[PDB]
Design a protein around this ligand. Structure first.
Ligand SMILES: *[C@@H]1O[C@H](CO)[C@@H](O[C@@H]2O[C@H](CO)[C@@H](O[C@@H]3O[C@H](CO)[C@@H](O)[C@H](O)[C@@H]3O)[C@H](O)[C@H]2NC(C)=O)[C@H](O)[C@H]1NC(C)=O
Ligand SMILES: *[C@@H]1O[C@H](CO)[C@@H](O[C@@H]2O[C@H](CO)[C@@H](O[C@@H]3O[C@H](CO)[C@@H](O)[C@H](O)[C@@H]3O)[C@H](O)[C@H]2NC(C)=O)[C@H](O)[C@H]1NC(C)=O
Ligand code: NAG
Lengths: 35, 35
């Protein structure tokens, strides 16, 4: 509905603030499921 | 001590904000943690 709305390879604002949570979580499950 | 207060669950969006990737995980863990 809004005019002038722009586009790029814009990441969601949701993930970069919570990178230290979800990225560490995914890395921990990947390390646990690797062997 | 507050007067005129009614009973209902609290309402302002922080729970779906940071737990966007976790509320679905909470629903999945409802069959794991609770029983
Ligand atoms: C700004 O970006 C959003 C998200 O990338 C765009 O939403 C996209 O909307 C189109 C149509 O509603 C969806 O299909 C696309 O159609 C165009 C034209 O047929 C085509 O060139 C694309 O390859 C694609 O098939 C598209 O799936 C949807 N994007 C996502 C991720 O779901 C929005 O249109 C963009 N706006 C402008 C002004 O660039
Ligand atoms: C919303 O919460 C209030 C307060 O818990 C409910 O009021 C009911 O009536 C009185 C207070 O107005 C409560 O009695 C007191 O409660 C304490 C526990 O906090 C208990 O140790 C004593 O029995 C004391 O007399 C009463 O327990 C409380 N009812 C319940 C079920 O907690 C009100 O009913 C609640 N509203 C809804 C829709 O749940
Ligand atoms: C509002 O005023 C009326 C006037 O009698 C009173 O009965 C009522 O208890 C008041 N409301 C509250 C929440 O105290």
């Amino acid at each position: 509905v809004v005019i002038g709305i722009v586009n790029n390879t814009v990441y969601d604002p949701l993930q970069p603030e919570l990178d230290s949570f979800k990225e560490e979580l995914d890395k921990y499950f990947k390390n646990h499921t690797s062997p």
